[PDB]
Amino acid sequence: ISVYEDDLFEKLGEEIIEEKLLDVCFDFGLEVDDIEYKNDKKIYKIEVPANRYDLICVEGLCRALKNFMCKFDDIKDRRGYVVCCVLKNMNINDSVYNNIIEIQEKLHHNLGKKRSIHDYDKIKKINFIPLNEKTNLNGMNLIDFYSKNLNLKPYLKIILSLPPIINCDHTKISLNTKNVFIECTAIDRNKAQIALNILCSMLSEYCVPKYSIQSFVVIYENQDFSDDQNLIFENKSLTCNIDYVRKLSGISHITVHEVNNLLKRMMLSCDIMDNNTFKVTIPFYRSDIMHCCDIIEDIAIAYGYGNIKYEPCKKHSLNNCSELFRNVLVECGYTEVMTNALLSRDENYNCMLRTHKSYDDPNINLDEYNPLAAPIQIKNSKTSEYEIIRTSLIVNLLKFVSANKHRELPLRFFEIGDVSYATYNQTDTNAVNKKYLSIIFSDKFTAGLEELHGVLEAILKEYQLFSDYKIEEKKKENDMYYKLIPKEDPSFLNERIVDIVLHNLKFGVLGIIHPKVLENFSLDIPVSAIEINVET
Amino acid sequence: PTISVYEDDLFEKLGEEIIEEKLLDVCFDFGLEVDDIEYKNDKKIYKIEVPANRYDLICVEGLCRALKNFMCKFDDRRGYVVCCVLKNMNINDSVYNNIIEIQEKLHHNLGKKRSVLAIGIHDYDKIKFPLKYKFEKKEKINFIPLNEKTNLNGMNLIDFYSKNLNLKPYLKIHTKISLNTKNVFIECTAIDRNKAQIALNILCSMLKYSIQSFVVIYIFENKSLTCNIDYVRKLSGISHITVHEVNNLLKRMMLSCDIMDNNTFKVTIPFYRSDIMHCCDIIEDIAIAYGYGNIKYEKHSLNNCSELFRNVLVECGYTEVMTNALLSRDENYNCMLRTHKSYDDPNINLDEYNPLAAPIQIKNSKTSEYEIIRTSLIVNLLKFVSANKHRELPLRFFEIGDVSYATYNQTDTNAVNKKYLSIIFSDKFTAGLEELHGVLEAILKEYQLFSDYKIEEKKSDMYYKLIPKEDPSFLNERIVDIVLFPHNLKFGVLGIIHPKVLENFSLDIPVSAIEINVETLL
Amino acid sequence: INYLLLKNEEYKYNFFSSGKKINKGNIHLLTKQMRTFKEIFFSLGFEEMETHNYVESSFWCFDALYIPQQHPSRDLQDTFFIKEPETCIDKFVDTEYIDNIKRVHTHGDYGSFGWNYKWKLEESKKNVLRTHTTANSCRALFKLAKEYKEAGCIKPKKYFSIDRVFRNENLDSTHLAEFHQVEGLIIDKNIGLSHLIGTLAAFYKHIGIHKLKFKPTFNPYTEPSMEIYGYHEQSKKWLEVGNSGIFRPEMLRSMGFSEEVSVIAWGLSLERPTMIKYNIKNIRDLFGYK
Amino acid sequence: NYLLLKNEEYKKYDIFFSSGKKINKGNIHLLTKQMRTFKEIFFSLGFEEMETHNYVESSFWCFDALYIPQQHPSRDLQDTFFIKEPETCIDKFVDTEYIDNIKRVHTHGDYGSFGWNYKWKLEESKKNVLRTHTTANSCRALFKLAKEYKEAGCIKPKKYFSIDRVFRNENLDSTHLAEFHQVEGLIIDKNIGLSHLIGTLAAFYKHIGIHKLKFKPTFNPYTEPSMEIYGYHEQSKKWLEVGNSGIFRPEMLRSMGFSEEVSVIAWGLSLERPTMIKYNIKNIRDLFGYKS
Ligand SMILES: COc1ccc(NC(=O)N2CCCCN3[C@H](CN(C)C)[C@H](c4ccc(C#Cc5ccccc5)cc4)[C@@H]3C2)cc1
Ligand SMILES: COc1ccc(NC(=O)N2CCCCN3[C@H](CN(C)C)[C@H](c4ccc(C#Cc5ccccc5)cc4)[C@@H]3C2)cc1
Ligand SMILES: [Mg+2]
C-alpha cells in the first residue's frame, strides 16, 4: 500500500521524524521492510491487517494513526433488491483519483475472493461497448475478446454492468467529476449495507460538506424492499467486564484509563454505569468479533504490550548435558569402563611421581574450576587397597589395562565420574567432589596423540571451542574458546605433554605417559591419555 | 543379628503338630528369617535371623513364647552393679547350652564388645550373707572362680592375669559352674540405673516363672503409649473397628487397655518389647498381625525409548539423514520395480504391522516431486544418495521416521501414520549384506540376543527369524524378509536392490539395505 | 617423534591444528537441537503431547480453532490437500456434533458473534495436511476438557509438541514446504498476558539471554496476539524470533472447559534457530543434502 | 559381489542365513544403560531428579539426622567406611531447627512421643563418614522443602528419587561387593500411609518386569513400619531381599518443622542385582570392572 510520503504529512499535518514514524507504526499493528521509492517521491508500502476494513485506504489509515498517538478525534436465493446508494455531490482530484482506484483494485479481488457505474452524472440484448472498446454482442458471446490476459476469466462466475467484472457501459461520470452515486451488487443482502456505509464514510473525506450526507433519511424507519425503491449505518454494542481484562492484560486497577485508551484508538466507550462494566460501541469501521477479546486487544495495544509490569524452572542440570559427551565419545569407537571406587596411596602417589598437597593453594578459596591435588585420605579399613579416594582417575584406568593383555590391538576407553579432594574453606563438609572425564588410547605397536587430538577437537566441535588456531585459520578463511599450551609434568613424556586453557583456567591435560610408569603398571605397550574437567 | 536359634524341641514346648513347610511360612510372615539350616547328627535343628530390636526374641524361650502367643493361641563412681537370686530352679544340658547362649547373647549381641555388658551368673547354693562392696579400689585378693585357673597364687603378678579366647582382657581393655543346682543367683554391672534395670530384668523371665527377690543395697516397670485411632486409620490404610485391635494386641502379647473416646486407645508396653518411643511401632505390630498383603490397595512409550536404536545405530560410523517430505508416484511405483498397491485392501492389511504399501496421494501440490507421501524411506535416501556420489568411499546412511498410508477402518480419518527406519550401505565394491547382517543381529542383540543362529544356545522365547522371500526390487536369492512372533508377523526386510532400479535412479555404486518397522516392537 | 619400543633398551612439535580425522559418525543437527529443546522443556516441568500424526482433518486443523474456512489458508496457494481418504467419520456427535462450533461460527456463544455464515460441514470434513501442529495439540485439550468436568478440579497443565508440519506457499527461495515447529501451551484458571510474557522471557532466555520486544498482530486462532523478537545482534540487531498469541474463549468455552479457564500458546520453528546456531545462512543444507 | 553395468548375467550362482558380521562396535556400560532405563521410568511417573553431588557425608546426616543411635553396629567399624581425614564439619541449623532438637531426641522426647535415653554427644555425631546410606543426600532435600513448606505452600505433594554409588566393606563377601549403585524413591504429602506405598510399589515393580506378589515384615531403624518386598520371577520357591521400603518416623520427621498431617514414604534397592537378573549374569565380579 503506497505511502505517498507527502500525502501523509498533509493528511496528518505533522512533522516529527522518519524513524519516529516507522516507530509509531511498528508500535501499531502494521510494519513493513522492503519498501522502495519511485522517482522524486520516497514512498513505502505496508501490510494492513485484514481483521478490520478501516485501514484499507491510506485515508482511513492515516486518520486512525492520527487518532492513535494522542492527536485526533472522531467524525459526525434469488436476491430481491441489491443496494447501490450514495449521495448527490462531491469533489475529486488526481491525488485522490489514484487512491480511489486502489480500493477498486484491492477490495474486489483480495476481500471479495474473485468478487462473489458510480456516476450520478447524466442519469435518471446488447446496445454498446463498456468503455475502451467499440463492440456489441446480443447474448453471451463476449469471452472471445480478451480472456487469457488479466481479465474476468479468472472470476467468471459460480453456477448496470456486472458485480465481478465491472464494465461501466451506460454511465460513468468521469475521472474528473462532481456528482457521484456509487453502486455495487453482492451475493446476499447482509454485507450490502456494510459496503455501502464503508464507501460512504470511506470517501466522505472527499465531499463538499466533509462527512455529511443528504439521503433525506428523516421520514421513515422501515424498509420493506418493495416500495422503498420499486414503484444504513448501524452500530453494535459489546458489554465488557473489567476484572476479566485486568486478569488478561496483566496490568490492572484502573478503569478511567480504559476510557482514555479507547478514545485514543477511535472507539468511544460508554461507561456502563457500574464500576465494572462497559457497553463499548463497535461501529461499522470494525469487523471484529463482538467478544471482548479484541476489545482488550485494543486496550493492550494502546497501553503498549511492552508496558506490562510482571516478570517472576531453572538451570537445574548438568548431568543431562554430560550424556552429550558420552554419546560423542562412544561415536568414536571408545568403550566405557567403570573403575574401582578407591585406589592405593602409592598407586596414585608413589607410582606416579606425585607430591600431592598444597592445601592452602595460594588463592584464598583454591579454585572452583580446576584440576586436582590436595587429595582426600581415608581411615584404615579391612581392605588392602582402600587407602584413598581418586584424585585423577586415569590410574585406575591404567590399572584396568594391566588386567586384559590379550584383547584387540587398539584399546580405546574413557570414563566420567565423581572425584573428591580436601577443601579447607567455606566448602561444606570441608571436602569437595567434582566430576571429571579421562580417556585413553593404546595400540600394541605405535602410539596415539594423533587420534586423541582429533577426538578432543571433535568433542569440542559440538560446543564451538577451537584450538586457538582453527579460529585463526577460519579468520584466515572467512572467540571465547580454548587453547593447548605445552607444559612440564613428570608423569608424562617430555615434548609430549600439554595442559589446556580457556580465562586462563587450566582444566585438562593431554599426554604420553613416561615409560617408567608403564614399567610400574606391568604394561608393555605405549598408551596416551587425557584428563579434563567438565564443571569448567 | 545372628543365627543362634536352636533345636526342634520347640514342637514339644508348643505341644502341637504343624509340619515344616507350614512353619517357615509363619516366620516369613512374622519378621523372622532363616536360610538353609542344619542338623546336629540326630537332632533336626535350625538357625534364625532374630532382630535385635526386641530382646524378647533373643532367647529360644522368649522366641518360642512369642511364636506361641503369636497366632490365635494364648571416689570412683562405680558402675551400679545389681545382683538378684532365685528360690528354686533346675537345669539340664539342653537348658545348660541355652542359658549359656543367653549369657553369650546379652554379651555379644547387646554388648558392643561388652563395655556396659557382662554376665555374672552362679548358683544360690553357696552362701547368703548380706554385704556391701562399693569402695575404693581394693585391699587384698586371693583367688577367683574361672575355669582356666586352679592355683590363684604363687607366680603371676597380682591384679592382672590375662589369658582367654579372644577378648581375654577387660580391666585395661573355677569353683563350680553350678551345673544341676536348684538355687541360683546372678550379678551384673551397668553404667547407671535405667539401663541397669533394662539389661537386668530380662533374666527374670526365665523359668513356673518365679524367682526370689534381689538384695537392694543403696523393680520390673511397665510403661504406656497413648494412640489416636484416625492416626492409625490413615497410616495402615484400613478402617479398623478397634476391637480387632484388642484381638491383635492379645495375639502379639500386648495387653492394651482401651481408653476410648471412640478415637483413642492406650497400650501397655512392657520391657520385653522392641522398645521405641513413638507409638509408631504399635501400628507396626497391628500391621504384622493384620498382614501386609491383605490391604485393599489399588502406559507405553515410543519416541523417547526409540532413540536406543538411534544411539546404537550411530555407533559404528552410520550417519542419520532427514528425508524429503514426499516423493512423486513414479518415484515409488515406476522407478521401483514394484508398482503395486492394495487399494481395496480389505483382506490385506488385516493388521497394520508389516511394512507394506497402500499409499495416499495429494492434490494441489507441487508438480515436480510432490504427488504422494513416502511408504518406504529408502527411495528418498537414494535420492540423497543420487546427489552425492562423489564423497568418500564407504557411504553409510540411515533414517527413522513416521510415514503414512490410507486405512479403510481403524481410524477416525481413515488414515494411519506409523514410524519405522531404513539403513543403507555402499562401498563401490561389495554390498554390505555381511556387514548389514552383523548390524541387524547386533540391534536384535540390543533387545533380544536372538536371531536364529547358534540357536538359543544353552550357555529363548518370543524372538525372530529371517525368512528368505522374493520381492522384485531386490536381487533374487539375495533378499530376505524378517519376522518375529508366535503370530508370524513379518516386519523387516533386508536385501540387495536390483540394479535396474539403479539405472532408473542414476545410481552407480552397489548398495545394500535394510528396512524394518519399529512401532510394532513391544 | 612417536615413541614405541619401550623395552628397557631406549637410546634417545606442531601443536598447530589437528590430527588426521578418520571415520566419524554423527547425528543430524536438527535432531540434536530437538534433543536440547526436549531437555529444557521437561526442565521447566512440561509434558510432551503426542503429535505423532500429520494428516489431521480440516476440522481439528481449522474449525476447532475457530477460523472461517473462507480465508487465505483454505486457498491452495498456501496449503496442501489430500484426496485419498478425503472423508472422516469419528467425530463427537455430541454438542450437536459440535454443531456448537458451527453455531459459534454462524451465531454467538460466550456472548460473542460468529460471521452470519452458513459454515457448512463438508469443508470441515476435507482431509488436509497439517500446516499448524497446534491442530493435533488442540485434540489432546478436549480430552482434558472431559476430565475437568469429570473431576471439577483445576490442574494447570504444561504441554509442548514438535513434529513435522507442512505448507505450500511457492517454490521461491523463501522457506520450504515441510518444516518443524516447537510449540508450548499452559492451561489454568484466571491467568493472563503477564504469565505469557514472563514464560516467553524465561524460555527464550534458555535459548540465549536477550531482552525482548513484541508487536501486536491480527490472527484468528488468538484474538489477542503478538509477534515476539529478541536481541542477539543479527542484522537489525535482533531477530523476529517466534510467534505467539493468547487464548480464544469463544471456541474455548464451547469445548466445555470452564468459564474461568484460560490457556496460552506459542509456536516457532526448529530449523530457523538451527540455521542461526550452527553458523548457517540459508535453509538448504540442514535439510536433505549436507 | 556386484560391480556390473552391462554384464548382468555372467552369474557364478546366486548362492546360509545363520550368522553375524561381528566387527568392531564400541559400546556403553551396562550399568549406565540401566541407569538410563530407570531415569526413563521415573520421569514417566512424574518424579524430580535429586542432586547426589557428594561422596562423603557427616555422620549426623548419615546416622543422627535420622533416629539412628550412635551406639550401634553400623557406627562400629568393619561394617562402614570412615574418612577421618577431614573428620570435622561445621554449620548445621542449630537455631531451633535441627541439632538441639535431635540431641534431645536421643536423650528425651519431642515432636511426638518421648524417649531415646542416651548421651547424645555432638562430636562423634560430627565425624565425617563415607556413605553407607544414600538417603543422606535425600534427607537434605527434605529440610529445604521444610522451609518452603513454611513459607507459603501448604500441601504440594512432592516426589523425589536419587541414585549414586554408596559403599560398605564387611570384609570380602562371597555374594556382594562395595555397593555399586543404589536406587531410592521418596514421596511426601499430607496424611499418607501404607496403602499408597503398596500401590506405588505395585506400579513400579510392575514396570520393571515383575508383579509384586508378597511383602514380609522386617525390622528397620529409620523406618519403623518397614518391609522386604518380593515380586515373582522364576528364581526359586525361596528368595532373597528384592529390595526394601518403609515409611519414616515422626521422631526425625517433625524435627524439621513439618506439619502434623505430614507423612512420607520411602523405598530403596540395589542397581547391580537387577541387572545381573536382566542380562542373565552371575557372580558380578567381571560384569563390573575388569573382564567387561
Ligand atoms: C533464536 O532462534 C530463532 C528462532 C526462530 C527464528 N525465526 C522464526 O521464528 N521464524 C522465521 C521468520 C519468518 C518465517 N516464519 C514462518 C511464518 N511466519 C512468518 C508467520 C514460521 C512460523 C510459523 C508459525 C509460527 C507460530 C505460531 C503460533 C503458535 C501458537 C500460537 C500462536 C502462534 C511460528 C513460526 C517462521 C518463524 C529465528 C531465530
Ligand atoms: C528385579 O530386580 C532386582 C532388584 C533387586 C534385587 N536384589 C536386591 O534388592 N538386593 C540384593 C539381595 C541382598 C543384598 N541387598 C543389600 C543389603 N540388604 C541385605 C539389606 C542391598 C540393599 C541395601 C539397602 C536397601 C534399602 C533400602 C531402603 C531405603 C529406604 C527405606 C527403607 C529401605 C536395598 C538393597 C541388596 C538388595 C534383585 C532383583
Ligand atoms: Mg485480535
Taking the centre of ligand 2 as the mean of its atom positions, its distance from the CA of residue D229, in whole angstroms, is 9
One-letter amino acid of A391: T
Residue D39 CA from chain centroid, whole number: 13
Q: Are D268 and D134 in contact (CB under 8 A)?
A: yes
One-letter amino acid of A268: L
Q: Are A24 and A65 in contact (CB under 8 A)?
A: yes
What residues in C contact B368, CB-CB < 8 Å? 171
Burial C103-128 (b: 16+ CB within 10 A, else e): bbbeeebbebbbeeeebeeebbbbbb
Number of CB atoms found within 10 A of residue B200's CB: 23
C-alpha cell, A139: 447474448
C-alpha cell, C19: 590430527
How far, in Å, CA of A120 to CA of A178, rounded?
A: 9
CATH number for the domain spanning A295: value is 3.30.56.10
C-alpha cell, B100: 549359656
Q: Kindly state whether residues B370 and B242 are assigned to the same domain.
A: no
How far, in Å, CA of B291 to CA of D216, rounded?
A: 9
Q: Are A465 and A481 in contact (CB under 8 A)?
A: yes
Residue A43: phi, psi to the nearest 5? -120, 175
* Total count of residues recorded for chain A: 536
Q: Are D89 and D126 in contact (CB under 8 A)?
A: yes
Strand partners, B233: none
Q: Are B453 and B445 in contact (CB under 8 A)?
A: no
Half-sphere exposure of B494 (CA within 13 A, CB side): 19
Q: Kindly state whether residues A286 and A328 are assigned to the same domain.
A: no
One-letter amino acid of C204: Y
Half-sphere exposure of B119 (CA within 13 A, CB side): 18
Strand partners, C225: C217
Mutation for testing the D interface, residue in B297, B304, B463 having most D CBs under 10 Å: B297
How far, in Å, CA of D266 to CA of D192, rounded?
A: 11
C-alpha cell, B514: 535394510
Q: Whose CA is nearest to atom 24 of ligand 2?
A: D269
Q: Which helix (H) or strand (E) holds A486?
A: strand A483-486
Half-sphere exposure of D249 (CA within 13 A, CB side): 28
Mutation for testing the C interface, residue in A77, A272, A292, A305 having most C CBs under 10 Å: A305
Q: Kindly state whether residues A251 and A370 are assigned to the same domain.
A: no
Q: Kindly state whether residues B272 and B378 are assigned to the same domain.
A: no
Q: Which helix (H) or strand (E) holds A417?
A: strand A411-422
Phi/psi-derived region of residue D179, left when phi > 0, alpha when psi is between -120 and 50, beta in every other case:
left
Q: Kindly state whether residues B282 and B384 are assigned to the same domain.
A: no
Residue C71: phi, psi to the nearest 5? -160, 170
- β-pairing verdict for D226-231 and D212-218: antiparallel
One-letter amino acid of B169: P
How far, in Å, CA of A529 to CA of A66, rounded?
A: 72
What are the binding residues of C? 223
How far, in Å, CA of D157 to CA of D262, rounded?
A: 10
Residue C115 CA from chain centroid, whole number: 27
**C-alpha radius of gyration, chain D, whole number:** 25
C-alpha cell, B118: 557382662
Is the Cα torsion angle D84, D90, D93, D99 positive or negative in sign? positive
Q: Which helix (H) or strand (E) holds C180?
A: strand C178-189
C-alpha cell, A130: 463498456
What does the longest C-alpha to C-alpha distance in chain B come to?
120
How far, in Å, CA of D230 to CA of D248, rounded?
A: 20
Kindly list the distances between the CA atom of residue D290 and the CA atoms of A399, A437, D287, in Å, as whole numbers in the listed order.
Answer: 10, 19, 7
Q: Which helix (H) or strand (E) holds B513?
A: strand B511-517
Q: Are B420 and B519 in contact (CB under 8 A)?
A: yes
Cβ contacts of B374 within 8 Å, gap of 6 or more: B323, B326, B327, B332, B380, B401, B403, B404
Q: Kindly state whether residues A297 and A343 are assigned to the same domain.
A: no
What ranges in chain D are assigned the alpha helix state H? 30-45, 59, 99-105, 123-126, 135-151, 194-207, 250-253, 272-278
Q: Which of A391, A380, A394, A389 shows the shortest CA–CA distance to A355?
A: A391
Q: Which of C131, A214, B438 shows the shortest CA–CA distance to D24?
A: B438
C70 touches chain A (CB under 8 A): yes
Terminal-to-terminal C-alpha distance of chain D: 37
How far, in Å, CA of C75 to CA of B389, rounded?
A: 40
Q: SS3 letters for B433-475?
A: HHHHHHHHHHHHHHHCCCCCCCCCCCCCCCCCEEEECCCCCEE
**Edge to edge, what strands does the sheet with D158-164 contain?**
D48-49, D158-164, D182-190, D262-270, D244-247, D226-231, D212-218
Kindly list the distances between the CA atom of residue A146 and the CA atoms of A142, A143, A151, in Å, as whole numbers in the listed order.
Answer: 9, 7, 7
Q: Are A49 and C217 in contact (CB under 8 A)?
A: yes
How far, in Å, CA of D229 to CA of A3, rounded?
A: 79
Burial class (CB in 10 A: 0-12, 13-18, 19+), B489: middle
Kindly list the distances between the CA atom of residue C240 and the CA atoms of A30, B379, C228, C269, C272, in Å, as whole numbers in the listed order.
Answer: 14, 36, 6, 11, 11
Number of CB atoms found within 10 A of residue A22's CB: 16
Q: Are B266 and B256 in contact (CB under 8 A)?
A: yes
Instruction: Please report the residues numbered 163 through 202 in chain D whose beta carbons come closer than 8 angstroms to any beta carbon of chain A.
Output: 164-165, 167, 169-172, 178
Breaks in chain B after residues, C-to-N cutoff 2.5 Å: 74, 173, 207, 218, 298, 459
How far, in Å, CA of A142 to CA of C147, rounded?
A: 63
Q: Are B208 and B88 in contact (CB under 8 A)?
A: no
Is the Cα torsion angle A423, A428, A429, A431 positive or negative in sign? negative
What residues in C contact A294, CB-CB < 8 Å? 223-224
Half-sphere exposure of A174 (CA within 13 A, CB side): 10
Cβ contacts of B156 within 8 Å, gap of 6 or more: none
One-letter amino acid of D14: D
Burial class (CB in 10 A: 0-12, 13-18, 19+), A392: buried
Q: Are B470 and B446 in contact (CB under 8 A)?
A: no
Burial class (CB in 10 A: 0-12, 13-18, 19+), A266: buried
Q: Chains B and D: how many Cβ contacts under 8 Å? A: 149
How far, in Å, CA of A200 to CA of A209, rounded?
A: 13
Phi/psi-derived region of residue D106, left when phi > 0, alpha when psi is between -120 and 50, beta in every other case:
alpha
How far, in Å, CA of B119 to CA of C263, rounded?
A: 75
Local structure of B8: helix, strand or coil: coil
Q: What approach was used to elucidate this structure?
A: X-ray
How far, in Å, CA of A72 to CA of A54, rounded?
A: 16
C-alpha cell, C38: 526436549
Cβ contacts of B230 within 8 Å, gap of 6 or more: B263
Is the Cα torsion angle B369, B374, B375, B378 positive or negative in sign? positive
Q: Whose CA is nearest to atom 21 of ligand 2?
A: D270
Residue B352: phi, psi to the nearest 5? -85, 35
- Crossing angle of helices B280-290 and B229-236, in 10° steps, is 50
Q: Kindly state whether residues A415 and A355 are assigned to the same domain.
A: yes
Q: Whose CA is nearest to atom 31 of ligand 1?
A: C266
Q: Kindly state whether residues A428 and A293 are assigned to the same domain.
A: no
Q: Which of B69, B40, B47, B43 shows the shortest CA–CA distance to B56?
A: B69
Q: Which residue shows C-alpha cell 546379652?
A: B106
Q: Are C238 and C72 in contact (CB under 8 A)?
A: no
Q: Kindly state whether residues A270 and A347 are assigned to the same domain.
A: no
Is the Cα torsion angle D274, D275, D280, D283 positive or negative in sign? negative
Torsion angle of the four alpha carbons B91, B93, B99, B104, in this order, in degrees rounded to the nearest 10 = 160
Q: What is the DSSP letter of C215?
A: E
- Crossing angle of helices B93-108 and B60-70, in 10° steps, is 100
Terminal-to-terminal C-alpha distance of chain B: 45
What does the longest C-alpha to C-alpha distance in chain D come to?
97
Cβ contacts of B304 within 8 Å, gap of 6 or more: C48, D40
Burial B459-474 (b: 16+ CB within 10 A, else e): eeeeebbbeeeeeebb
One-letter amino acid of B469: K
How far, in Å, CA of D217 to CA of A469, rounded?
A: 66
Q: Are D245 and D267 in contact (CB under 8 A)?
A: yes
One-letter amino acid of A529: A
Q: Which of A234, A271, A267, A281 shows the shortest CA–CA distance to A74?
A: A267
Q: Which of A310, A317, A493 sits opposite C197 (nearest CB)?
A: A310
Taking the centre of ligand 2 as the mean of its atom positions, its distance from the CA of residue D270, in whole angstroms, is 5
What are the binding residues of C for Mg(2+)? 223
Q: Kindly state whether residues A264 and A377 are assigned to the same domain.
A: no
D69 touches chain B (CB under 8 A): no
Residue D124: phi, psi to the nearest 5? -60, -35
Are the Cβ atoms of D214 and B293 closer than 8 angstroms? yes
- β-pairing verdict for B474-483 and B490-497: antiparallel
- β-pairing verdict for B185-188 and B82-85: antiparallel
How far, in Å, CA of A369 to CA of B192, rounded?
A: 54
How far, in Å, CA of A115 to CA of A57, rounded?
A: 19
Residue-number span of the structural domain to which A357 is assigned: 319-533
**Data resolution in angstroms:** 3.6
Task: Tally DSSP H helices, then E strands, for chain C.
Answer: 9, 7
Q: Which of C81, B312, C280 shows the shortest CA–CA distance to A330?
A: B312
Half-sphere exposure of A318 (CA within 13 A, CB side): 12
D22 touches chain B (CB under 8 A): yes
Q: Which of C134, C220, C187, C246 shows the shortest CA–CA distance to A308?
A: C246
B361 touches chain C (CB under 8 A): yes
What are the binding residues of D? 224
One-letter amino acid of A70: C
How far, in Å, CA of A33 to CA of A320, rounded?
A: 42
Burial class (CB in 10 A: 0-12, 13-18, 19+), C265: buried
Strand partners, C269: C181
Q: Which of D132, D83, D49 shows the shortest CA–CA distance to A429?
A: D83
Phi/psi-derived region of residue A118, left when phi > 0, alpha when psi is between -120 and 50, beta in every other case:
left
C-alpha cell, B2: 545372628
How far, in Å, CA of D218 to CA of D243, rounded?
A: 12
Number of CB atoms found within 10 A of residue B272's CB: 21
Q: Which of B325, B430, B432 shows the shortest CA–CA distance to B379?
A: B325
* Total count of residues recorded for chain C: 290
Q: Which residue shows C-alpha cell 440484448?
A: A125
How far, in Å, CA of B412 to CA of C89, rounded?
A: 6
Q: Which of B225, B278, B430 sits opposite D251 (nearest CB)?
A: B278
Kindly list the distances between the CA atom of residue D108 and the CA atoms of B164, B268, B275, C41, D113, in Å, as whole numbers in the listed order.
Answer: 40, 19, 14, 49, 9
How far, in Å, CA of A204 to CA of A212, rounded?
A: 7
Q: What does B91-136 look like in DSSP terms, one character per residue?
A: --HHHHHHHHHHHHHHHHTSSSSSSS---EEE-SSS---------S
Q: Kindly state whether residues A381 and A518 are assigned to the same domain.
A: yes
Q: Which residue shows C-alpha cell 568403550?
A: A335
Q: Which helix (H) or strand (E) holds A432?
A: strand A431-442
Terminal-to-terminal C-alpha distance of chain C: 37
How far, in Å, CA of D268 to CA of D271, rounded?
A: 10
Q: Are D224 and D84 in contact (CB under 8 A)?
A: no
